[PDB]
Amino acid sequence: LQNIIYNPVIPFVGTIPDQLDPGTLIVIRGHVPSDADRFQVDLQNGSSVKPRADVAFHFNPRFKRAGCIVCNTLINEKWGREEITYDTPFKREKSFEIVIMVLKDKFQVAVNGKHTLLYGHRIGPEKIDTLGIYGKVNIHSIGFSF
Ligand SMILES: OC[C@H]1O[C@@H](O[C@H]2[C@H](O)[C@@H](O)[C@@H](O)O[C@@H]2CO)[C@H](O)[C@@H](O)[C@H]1O
């Protein structure tokens, strides 16, 4: 793993150190705190706050009731169709590893050593240069393989 970021402060907004070509991994190890209702990993085009940077890939675990993962894309400050994965491995007070693998046509995401979901590209992954992590989460490490 390359360009590892250790224990970043959340909210984190970092420049991804290379283009996300097919086969690239983003690996994120962390922990959901006991009072967490949600957090998010956003692959974004730039880091503008107003107007809000486009989010190619919004990966948003949610913990209310039985919980779920919501995926979407933000284009021109509008959210598109939500893709909700209900078989969620995330739990409050548990550790996790997320591996996002960028393929040509989709993202392939594995959580805790197990395939979790797919997400077809809506914005070309070549437009992504920024990783954002927000909400209630404790991130121990961010690693990249190009
Ligand atoms: O799709 C991701 C965004 O959802 C926004 O919340 C949605 C909510 O999930 C949906 O059920 C509906 O009622 O409308 C809300 C507004 O679009 C969150 O506010 C945003 O942060 C993203 O997670």
Curated annotation (Swiss-Prot):
This is Galectin-8. Keywords: Autophagy, Cytoplasm, Cytoplasmic vesicle, Lectin, Repeat. Homodimer. Interacts with CALCOCO2/NDP52. Interacts with PDPN; the interaction is glycosylation-dependent; may participate in connection of the lymphatic endothelium to the surrounding extracellular matrix. The chain holds residues 8 to 153 of 317 of the full protein. Beta-galactoside-binding lectin that acts as a sensor of membrane damage caused by infection and restricts the proliferation of infecting pathogens by targeting them for autophagy. Detects membrane rupture by binding beta-galactoside ligands located on the lumenal side of the endosome membrane; these ligands becoming exposed to the cytoplasm following rupture. Restricts infection by initiating autophagy via interaction with CALCOCO2/NDP52. Required to restrict infection of bacterial invasion such as S.typhimurium. Also required to restrict infection of Picornaviridae viruses. A carbohydrate binds at R62, N72, E82. GO terms for biological process: cellular response to virus; lymphatic endothelial cell migration; plasma cell differentiation; T cell costimulation; xenophagy. Contains two homologous but distinct carbohydrate-binding domains. The keyword Cytoplasm applies. The gene is LGALS8. It is found in: Cytoplasmic vesicle; Cytoplasm, Cytosol. Residues 12-145 form the Galectin domain. Transmembrane segments: none annotated. It comes from Homo sapiens (Human). Ubiquitous. Selective expression by prostate carcinomas versus normal prostate and benign prostatic hypertrophy. GO terms for cellular component: cytoplasm; cytoplasmic vesicle; cytosol; extracellular space; membrane.
